[PDB]
Design a protein around this ligand. Sequence first.
Ligand SMILES: Nc1ncnc2c1ncn2[C@@H]1O[C@H](COP(=O)(O)OP(=O)(O)OP(=O)(O)O)[C@@H](O)[C@H]1O
Ligand SMILES: [Mg+2]
Ligand SMILES: [Zn+2]
Length: 619
Amino acid sequence: DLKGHSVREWVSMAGPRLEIHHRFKNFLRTHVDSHGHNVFKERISDMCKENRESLVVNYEDLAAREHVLAYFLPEAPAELLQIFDEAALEVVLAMYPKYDRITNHIHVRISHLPLVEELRSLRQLHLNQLIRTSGVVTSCTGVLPQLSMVKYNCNKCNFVLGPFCQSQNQEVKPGSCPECQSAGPFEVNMEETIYQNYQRIRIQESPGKVAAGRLPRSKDAILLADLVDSCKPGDEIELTGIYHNNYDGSLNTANGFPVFATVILANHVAKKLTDEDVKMITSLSKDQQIGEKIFASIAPSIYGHEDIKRGLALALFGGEPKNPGGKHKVRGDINVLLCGDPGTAKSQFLKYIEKVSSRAIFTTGQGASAVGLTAYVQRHPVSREWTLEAGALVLADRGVCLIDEFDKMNDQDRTSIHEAMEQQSISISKAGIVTSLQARCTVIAAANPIGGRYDPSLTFSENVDLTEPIISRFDILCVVRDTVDPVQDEMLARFVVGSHVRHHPSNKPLPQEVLKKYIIYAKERVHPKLNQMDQDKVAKMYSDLRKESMATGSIPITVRHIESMIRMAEAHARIHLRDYVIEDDVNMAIRVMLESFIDTQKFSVMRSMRKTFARYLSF
DNA sequence: AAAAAAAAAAAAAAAAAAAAAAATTTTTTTTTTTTTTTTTTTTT
DNA sequence: AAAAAAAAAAAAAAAAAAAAATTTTTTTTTTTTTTTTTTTTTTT
Ligand SMILES: Nc1ncnc2c1ncn2[C@@H]1O[C@H](COP(=O)(O)OP(=O)(O)OP(=O)(O)O)[C@@H](O)[C@H]1O
Ligand SMILES: [Mg+2]
Ligand SMILES: [Zn+2]
């Protein structure tokens, strides 16, 4: 019921405390379901099955069945939340009385609060009220331990001053010891205390929602005991919490308006491997067109460059790493370099790889890089803790670093990427950190040739500004020429304009994550083995290719290329999800490796090799 | 050989950690001085 | 034999003495960061 006094004082009175606690118990037990299920029974069943420590309830259901509580909720949320903690504790103990050891506490979260305010507009009129809001996490410190029921050693006599509850507002302070009667220098008993997880995030208004002439505004937020690490930086998150002012934040200091900071005790944060995967992946792997389906599922937002779609497929699935003895580093990573004249989807390719492949990061030879190739240690600014920011490769240790504009990286990045793909370990020796972080990168890269146009007369090495050892070890070199042509340009223009009209704001092969599950399955679980290839055929293949390449200015095919051939064979076997490499796979790996080698070779020699080796490129 | 560009050095400014600096009378006890009362010893 | 002086013991009151007692804030220091100058190094 209602009276002249305020809502908060009302709900503070004991009579209505029992009233609303009874009402919460009542609808917890009785609000069966939309369609007669008693959903609270099943929710509590799962809650205690995992020991989640936290229930969540829908505000629409709350208000619809019992509306007085819903109206009271934003007015004096703290008191209602405490009582619902107690009532939920009662009902969960009723369902499972064995729960008593489990945390002695249940939190309750409220979802779908109808009235969302915007971080631009949170005024005095929302203090001490439960609001709903949206934003992006700009920072999120680590999980810290907070006092929740603290016991103090009176260090005059070592009496254990009993467990004081710790509100978020002001630090608890014992008056005196019940034994020796001193307000002594008390100090926390580290053990008998039962702490509580504390994490501090900072959300800000999303640029997609910020207005024209503006700076997005940022509100702090505190996560406690179950929601810590429920959201990482850059996550678009809805936040529901008690917008809050009265803790100790106030500019009572000199030189300041009497102006208060604010926080949000977050009461609900909402962001915005498997089984049967073997079944689906193997069932489609039966099809045996799966190689071309993968080749046509890789990079659908690009036209042409089928050679590079295939090549990046082989780079994505990789080979296998081996070490005969503890003496020979032979690698499973297939490194790729697109070299292309401008405006030919190099960065488009790279961003597709970043989107699709797990443990992918992006980096640029220029200084605009999100993540850097070098490794450095400093005090990271948004956290101000002294990190070892290990570079881009190490951060992409398993999967892919993607080096866009590979042809302009500063000489330090040249040194670092060379030493990465050569050693496969990045050797840091800056402050006192003389270590070697292993970097099993699978580098993809893009490079614009000299003069902004590919020059078929000169060779690849001398018309791209990447020095010989760097250009060598890349398992695939691909050339991208923007050759003017009627039908090609017609097709490209029609595709682009179709995308544009489709992407007007009025209109608002295998799927990509299907391919991603395929990627991890065939990258870790499946290791095709090789005793089933015409060893003599490939040995004579190297013989014939190098024998033709014997000439001046004709740096020949070598063992680098023959091991790259085996890597590509394994990769195609992986791609076929087989457990044994087959002559078909060996033929395809031969085809792609030889295509890469001839197109590396300049025009006249390219035509000689193409004419005399068309039998393999025929397949 | 001199000009342009880049890298490193020098110097000022800021943020946090941890060691220093400052404030700071009132109530209870209990010994000592004084008085008082009952008794015994001595004198009229 | 009665009166009285003295003795010891008991009590009240005033002066002196006894005892009790962590917390908050400020400042130096260290350490990085940033700007701008100077220096050095690469180019035509
Ligand atoms: N084959 C293609 N299919 C689709 N879009 C393409 C293709 N070739 C070029 N484009 C378009 O060209 C534009 C430039 O693409 P991209 O970012 O890859 O440039 P680039 O050639 O790598 O240039 P740069 O050297 O400046 O990085 C993008 O709009 C991309 O869509
Ligand atoms: Mg590009
Ligand atoms: Zn004590």
